[PDB]
Design a protein around this ligand. Structure first.
Ligand SMILES: C[C@H](N[C@@H](CCc1ccccc1)C(=O)O)C(=O)N1CCC[C@H]1C(=O)O
Ligand SMILES: [Cl-]
Ligand SMILES: [Cl-]
Ligand SMILES: [Zn+2]
Length: 574
């Protein structure tokens, strides 16, 4: 029957390309122009792609994968047997698709208004307030307001969403949706592996947390900061306190060594969103990697539209499954934070182009984390003082500690948050957390892992998780935790291949062909082989390891311990 198998995969591939390309079209139109019309069309297309999935998935299940000889065919067919949402009865499928659409629309058009009439959208208004305001009450207004308008509005849809996504998972052979999502890593030991990694980063996070807590105590006052407790969630310069880069000014280790206004420098010399992506595109090509197609610059939405249409601003990279059309949709703002995001997204695009010739079923990253790490790796080099100086955006061991601190505020602060999100969802999916306890358990984890507390007590009806994009958008989050760990492993390996010597944090792989080759060879595998092989190709070993990230920040860890020790900090919280 081996003959029927290769034939099946061939038909699945050519037909999937057509249907998936049409779907991406409708999805893009909705995402870049939210209207009743584009919404209705997208929902119609959902039913069409579902019909295709059910047709080929039903056939795939007729094959006994065990008796299949060719490992590539065996792998593709096993994957096609998973119908995902298409496994749901037609009635539940349309209800599920509408719920997803409603949650996405609700989140993307939510606004927080003042008594007068001035209403602010998340991007860039509220994001700017959280990043620049140093007034406790103004930060509270934005923090609470976003949750009141976005979070609370998602609550009416979540319980049903959970019921339906779990039903689909069970109909595909999994115990629940969390089980289904975790399966993407093909790693039985996943939960234990990630827990060990999280634990290895505790010394660093706890020391950074204590140091930043002391700084906030200095700025906002003893009456608002408990030196032995959690930090109010609205003072970290970010709506979700997932990255603390924006309060660098309040915590700079050596204020005597001033650093240029990077964001002001970009604006000062006319940097634009297009320039930002052009620079990222240049970094990739410098490594010998692929440049984005001409079509990319013509079809991407790199700026928030001003023609009246409403859009999903949250940045994302798109593969239209025809090996030629790739696009990015981002409401880009001119600043260093979004420059890094630009590289992040361009990393996804590079992966798309690298595996474009593989069967559609295998056009995915070695694991989701790999897809998320590519752009971040290059951004690590872009963020170095020397590289920023080469871009004319910047002009001592102290400058070194300041830099590591800036890097830690983003990378280290994000570790517990990235770990937390799916620890919460997996327990919602497995029934451990009911709708009565959604919010309470979210905050229990926010405290346990991040050491944060809500500035305003939560009340019945609040659903703070809904105020975070990936929740109503139903996008898994553990990939970001994996990404932050492995991106440093990649940085370390690529730097070693590039001939770098000395402190790892001083490495800049710009123009390194050796580094480019390692990334390309790995990306070309797509999802054709277990991820340890792609890991081996890049790093020379097959496991995930926190050693690289710890090595990168070693100088900061030493500095933080000394600093916290002399101030008598009590690490942690009750
Ligand atoms: C800006 C970026 N966007 C997402 C998009 C996710 C997504 C998947 C499927 C459909 C729409 C959006 C991405 O990974 O590119 C993002 O959300 N990131 C990057 C790092 C951490 C995470 C965050 O900001 O929470
Ligand atoms: Cl929150
Ligand atoms: Cl994931
Ligand atoms: Zn990403």
């Amino acid at each position: 029957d081996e003959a029927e198998a290769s034939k099946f995969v061939e038909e699945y591939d050519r037909t999937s390309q057509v249907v998936w390309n049409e779907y991406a079209e409708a999805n893009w139109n909705y995402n870049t122009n939210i209207t009743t019309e584009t919404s209705k069309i997208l929902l119609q297309k959902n039913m069409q792609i579902a019909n295709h999935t059910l047709k080929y998935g039903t056939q795939a299940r007729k094959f006994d994968v065990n008796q299949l000889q060719n490992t590539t065919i065996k792998r593709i067919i096993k994957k096609v047997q998973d119908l995902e949402r298409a496994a749901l009865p037609a009635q539940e499928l349309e209800e599920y698709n509408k719920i997803l659409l409603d949650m996405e629309t609700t989140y993307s058009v939510a606004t927080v208004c003042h008594p007068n009439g001035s209403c602010l959208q998340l991007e860039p208004d509220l994001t700017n307030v959280m990043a620049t305001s140093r007034k406790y009450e103004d930060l509270l207004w934005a923090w609470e307001g976003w949750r009141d308008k976005a979070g609370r509005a998602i609550l009416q849809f979540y319980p049903k969403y959970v019921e339906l996504i779990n039903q689909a998972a069970r109909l595909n052979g999994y115990v629940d949706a969390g089980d289904s999502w975790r399966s993407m890593y093909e790693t039985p030991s996943l939960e234990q592996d990630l827990e060990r990694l999280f634990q290895e980063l505790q010394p660093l996070y706890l020391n950074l947390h204590a140091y930043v807590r002391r700084a906030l105590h200095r700025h906002y006052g003893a009456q608002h900061i408990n030196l032995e407790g959690p930090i109010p969630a609205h003072l970290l310069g970010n709506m979700w306190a997932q990255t603390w880069s924006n309060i660098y000014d309040l915590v700079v280790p050596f204020p005597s060594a001033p650093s240029m206004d990077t964001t002001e420098a970009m604006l000062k010399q006319g940097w634009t969103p297009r320039r930002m992506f052009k620079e990222a595109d240049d970094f990739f090509t410098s490594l010998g990697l692929l440049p984005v197609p001409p079509e990319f610059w013509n079809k991407s939405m790199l700026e928030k539209p001003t023609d009246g249409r409403e859009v999903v601003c949250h940045a994302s990279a798109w593969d239209f499954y025809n090996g030629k059309d790739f696009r990015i949709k981002q409401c880009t703002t001119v600043n260093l934070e979004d420059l890094v995001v630009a590289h992040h997204e361009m990393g996804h695009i590079q992966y798309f182009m690298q595996y474009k010739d593989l069967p559609v079923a295998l056009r995915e990253g070695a694991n989701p984390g790999f897809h998320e790490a590519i752009g971040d790796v290059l951004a690590l080099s872009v963020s170095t003082p020397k590289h920023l100086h080469s871009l004319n955006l910047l002009s001592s061991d102290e400058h070194d500690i300041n830099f590591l601190m800036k890097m830690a505020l983003d990378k280290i602060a994000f570790i517990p948050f990235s770990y937390l999100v799916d620890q919460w969802r997996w327990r919602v999916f497995d029934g451990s957390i009911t709708k009565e306890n959604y919010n309470q358990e979210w905050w229990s984890l926010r405290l346990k892992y991040q050491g944060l507390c809500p500035p305003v007590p939560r009340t019945q009806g609040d659903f703070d998780p809904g105020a975070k994009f990936h929740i109503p958008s139903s996008v898994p989050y553990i990939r970001y935790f994996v990404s932050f760990i492995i991106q440093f492993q990649f940085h370390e390996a690529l730097c070693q291949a590039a001939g770098h010597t000395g402190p790892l944090h001083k490495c800049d792989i710009y123009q390194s062909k050796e580094a480019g080759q390692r990334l390309a060879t790995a990306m070309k595998l797509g999802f054709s082989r277990p991820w340890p092989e792609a890991m081996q190709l890049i790093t020379g070993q097959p496991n995930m390891s926190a050693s690289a990230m710890l090595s990168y920040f070693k100088p900061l860890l030493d500095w933080l311990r000394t600093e916290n020790e002399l101030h008598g900090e009590k690490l942690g919280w009750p």
